[PDB]
């Protein structure tokens, strides 16, 4: 019988890309009390992987759902954890202060109503210059950044900030597909894929203009972009090996507790032990030059061989143009100019000192009025990390021929998550399939 | 007041029964993999529906949703397997897979005459997954492919 | 210290085939439709249930319920469709609808020996709709004809 008959097959290995929500597993988690220790499966340490043979698939990092996940999810969860914490409304009282004895941080005093009736005026609040806003000519009286938009949520003393390895996996009916290929562009077809039960460890580090503690490239430094032609989009540079950087510590200090309400506690810094020290980071100058060179090579690969220029940030708000940095649960904003002050063409110290500012009022993700207050950490904070990549932007106003100009990049944090999620897809399984064959469903 | 009749076996009635006889109570177990509020009552259903409604706005209602969904998943977790195998229920069924003695050599006269289901179960815990997979491939391999070909003229 | 044995081909390994070979492992594929944590999975499942004890959270927690319910519903949707078609069990089920060459006329040999399910999907995607309808009519007429 030349005429073929329809036969239904069930359990047919096919898939379609589709939007869904993944199941977070906060691997390897008084504890306490972050990351998603209360919004994500406690532990899932052992990933599974199945290699596929003669298959191909098209990947597109720049439109990948999983980023939107983390972008919402992280904000959501971080926000959540602060709901039951103290709102420092009394603190908005007009402060009066004085530079601390050797420009400088200041030793402030202020009236505040607490306990019963009346108030206690004489205080020892050591605030950093970039947390306050001077009012009225040269008077020493003023108030915190933008109290007009609340910005007073004190992060619970018990809540840590430490970024921990988290994994994502797919719910029943979905599968995570990964491109098993070195040099993968981040955009286009992959000729060697495999499925995974979960992703590899992700490290949710909030930082800007600088990719820290991520995954490394294997052969040679790589540069990814949605559209190199389009000068308005940020490019992502992933190092072939990391560059270690050690960031330092302020004056040693003691945290003071201030009673502000019926159990409401406000923490600040009141006592300095020993000399006043400048917080900064140190990095090998030579090593930076080494890997910078590596990058430059590939930048040249992207436009013939035009000379490469690195200019520091265009200028503006420190919280935008300096590189933010997490360490010890405190927030640094450091000047990066020394790292982006070079030109490269056809052809000093040992390390670089990068001065940092230490802030306490932090506006996370440029939210409107939802800024927080970071309580101070007793003692000094020593931390060191590994630079694993860069976020760069090509200057749209390049009018000099023979050169290509870059500045520290920009955009939101979505790009920051891309640095890990650039090889994963989430697809839905479609069990039912139908194909012709030479057999008829017999009656009776 | 309330007076009482008689079994009518009963839930888990065969739990300690010798497997040979316990094998004939499968109807009781299967009947209740979705329950504990059986029969109208008919005030219990009324109450449960009332709490399912009233508590729809709060955590305790959510915990009931959680439990209910769990029940369904567990049910379907077994139905899926029974569907995949050529054993749509039917309380029992046989396969083409030969018993591999590596799993257990024990004599059937010991099994069916002096052992509970739980004792028996202890002995095959580590071979469960293997056994399933072998049933699965036996189901597909030939019993379905060749079957298709047996209607091929 | 963990050692590795043999296959026993796992989840989606069949994608490399070749529909002729893809008739195998249909169970391997199907069996995992309701779980990404198949098996007791000591030191996983325990945490999976522990997490569901922690559903005093709102918004976030409830999203997981949505996920679970949709998984169940997705499964059941397919089960109903197969029931309608008279394919209650299981893997392979032939119909009495003759293949319309309009949909495709590639050699049978091409299909099974040198074509992959993913491709097949792409090729006859636009006809899926009416194919299903026709299958329903078959079973409908069979309900009455078998009387």
């Amino acid at each position, epitope marked *: 019988t030349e005429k073929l008959w329809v036969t239904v097959y069930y359990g047919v290995p096919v898939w379609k890309e589709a939007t869904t929500t993944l199941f977070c597993a906060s691997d*390897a988690k008084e504890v306490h009390n972050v990351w998603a220790t209360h919004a994500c499966v406690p*532990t899932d*340490p*052992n990933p*599974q*992987e*199945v290699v596929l043979e003669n298959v191909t698939e098209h990947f597109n990092m720049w439109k990948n759902n999983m980023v939107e996940q983390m972008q919402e999810d992280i904000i959501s969860l971080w926000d959540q954890s602060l709901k039951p914490c103290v709102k420092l409304t009394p603190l908005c009282v007009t402060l009066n202060c004085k530079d601390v004895n050797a420009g400088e941080i200041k030793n402030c005093s202020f009236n505040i109503t607490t306990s019963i009736r009346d108030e206690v005026q004489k205080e020892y609040a050591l605030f950093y210059k970039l947390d306050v806003v001077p009012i009225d000519n040269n008077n020493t009286s003023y108030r915190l950044i933008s109290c007009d938009t609340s910005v007073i949520t004190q992060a619970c003393p018990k809540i840590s900030f430490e970024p921990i390895p988290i994994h994502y996996c797919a719910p029943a009916g979905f599968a995570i597909l990964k491109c098993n290929d070195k040099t993968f562009n981040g955009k286009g077809p992959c000729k060697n894929v495999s499925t995974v*039960q979960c992703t590899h460890g992700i490290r949710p580090v909030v930082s800007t203009q600088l990719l820290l503690n991520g995954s490394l490239a294997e052969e040679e430094v790589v540069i990814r972009s949605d559209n190199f032609t389009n000068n308005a989009k940020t490019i992502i540079v992933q190092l072939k090996e990391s560059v270690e950087i050690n960031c330092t510590r302020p004056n040693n200090n003691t945290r003071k507790s201030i009673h502000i309400g019926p159990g409401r506690a406000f923490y600040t810094t009141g006592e300095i032990i020993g000399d006043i020290r400048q917080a900064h980071c140190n990095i090998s100058r030579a090593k930076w030059n080494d890997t910078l060179k590596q990058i430059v090579i590939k930048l040249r690969e992207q436009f013939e061989n035009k000379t490469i220029v690195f200019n520091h940030s265009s200028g503006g708000d420190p919280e935008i143009v300096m590189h933010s940095f997490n360490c010890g649960g405190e927030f640094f904003y450091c000047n990066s100019t020394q790292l982006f002050n070079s030109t490269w063409n056809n052809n000093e110290g040992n390390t670089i000192t990068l001065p940092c500012r230490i802030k306490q009022i932090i506006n996370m993700w440029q939210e409107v009025g939802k800024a927080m207050y970071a309580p101070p950490i007793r003692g000094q904070i020593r931390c060191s990390s590994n630079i694993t990549g860069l976020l760069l932007t090509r200057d749209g106003g390049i009018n000099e021929n023979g050169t290509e100009i870059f500045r520290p990049g920009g955009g939101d944090m979505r790009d920051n998550w891309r640095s890990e999620l650039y090889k994963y897809k989430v697809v839905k399984i479609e069990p039912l399939g139908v194909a012709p064959t030479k057999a008829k469903r017999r009656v009776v | 007041a309330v007076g009482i009749g008689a079994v009518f076996l009963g839930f888990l009635g065969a739990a300690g029964s010798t497997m040979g006889a316990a094998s004939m109570t499968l109807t009781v177990q299967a009947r209740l993999l979705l329950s504990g509020i059986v029969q109208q009552q008919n005030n219990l259903l009324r109450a449960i529906e009332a709490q399912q409604r009233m508590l729809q706005l709060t955590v305790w209602g959510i915990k009931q949703l959680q439990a209910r969904v769990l029940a369904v998943e567990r049910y379907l977790g077994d139905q899926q397997l029974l569907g995949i195998w050529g054993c749509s229920g039917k309380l029992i069924c046989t396969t083409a897979v030969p018993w591999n003695a590596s799993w257990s050599n024990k004599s059937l006269d010991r099994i069916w005459n002096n052992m509970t289901w739980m004792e028996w179960e202890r002995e095959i815990d*580590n*071979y469960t*997954s*293997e056994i*399933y*997979t072998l049933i699965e491939e036996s189901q597909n391999q030939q019993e379905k492919n060749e079957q298709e070909l047996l209607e091929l003229d | *210290a*963990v*050692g*590795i*044995g*043999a*296959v*026993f*081909l*796992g*989840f989606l*390994g069949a994608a490399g085939s070749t529909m002729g070979a893809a008739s195998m492992t249909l169970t*391997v594929q199907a*069996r*995992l439709l309701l779980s*990404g944590i*198949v*098996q007791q999975q*000591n*030191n996983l499942l325990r945490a999976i249930e522990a997490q569901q004890r922690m559903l005093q959270l709102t918004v976030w927690g409830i999203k997981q319920l949505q996920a679970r319910v949709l998984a169940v519903e997705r499964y059941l949707g397919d089960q109903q469709l197969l029931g309608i078609w008279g394919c209650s069990g299981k893997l392979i089920c032939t119909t009495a609808v003759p293949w319309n060459a309009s949909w495709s006329n590639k050699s049978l040999d091409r299909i099974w020996n040198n074509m992959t399910w993913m491709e097949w999907e792409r090729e006859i995607d636009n006809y899926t709709s009416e194919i299903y309808t026709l299958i329903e009519e078959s079973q409908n007429q069979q309900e009455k004809n078998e009387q």
Partner: antibody
Amino acid sequence: RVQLVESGGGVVQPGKSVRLSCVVSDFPFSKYPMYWVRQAPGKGLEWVAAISGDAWHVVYSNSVQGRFLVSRDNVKNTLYLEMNSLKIEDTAVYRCARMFQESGPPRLDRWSGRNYYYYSGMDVWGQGTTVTVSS
Amino acid sequence: DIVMTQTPLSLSVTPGQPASISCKSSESLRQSNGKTSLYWYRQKPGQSPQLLVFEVSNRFSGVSDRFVGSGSGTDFTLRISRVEAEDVGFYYCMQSKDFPLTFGGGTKVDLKR
């Protein structure tokens, strides 16, 4: 005991091949994977090789990879470690030992389809035998 | 490969004086079944290897009560309470999370004189 007995040692020249044998008294075997280790005259301990309880999975140390051969006979209750192409560095006292926990049968993972084995530390050693190399 | 080291090789003790040996690992030994894959061993000159503890803070049956394991994360320890003069000998840390199975420094306890 679980009494471990080893023999077949001595001194041999480089490039030769040997066999070491290990017999254990009063011991199930089928439920227990076994180890071979190396105590060097250079005063250190090295793991050399491991073999599953049912002799279906064997792992070698990187230094002996492609040189040594572990095998089993669970009916005769005996382990064998042969050694091909001996090099001078291999001069050492080799010790036959047994694992600490019991091992169950390999567990088949239904998601990946891989048949996994689980290993562990060890609790009983013999005294092994000295095997030296050169002239 | 997982590698690791122990305290400096020569540890002198006295009868009745407790003493401890740590073991620093290159990677946390968390195992997939929810436990930590760390073992301690010892042996005397002319004496085959003996098992001291088999889990972190869980000594092995037959081993004296003096032996108290502890520690966590990436760096663990073994403390012997009330060290006896007969506790001298070589001490080894051993990891079993992955292959190859490796050993620590191989320290040795001896007496003060």
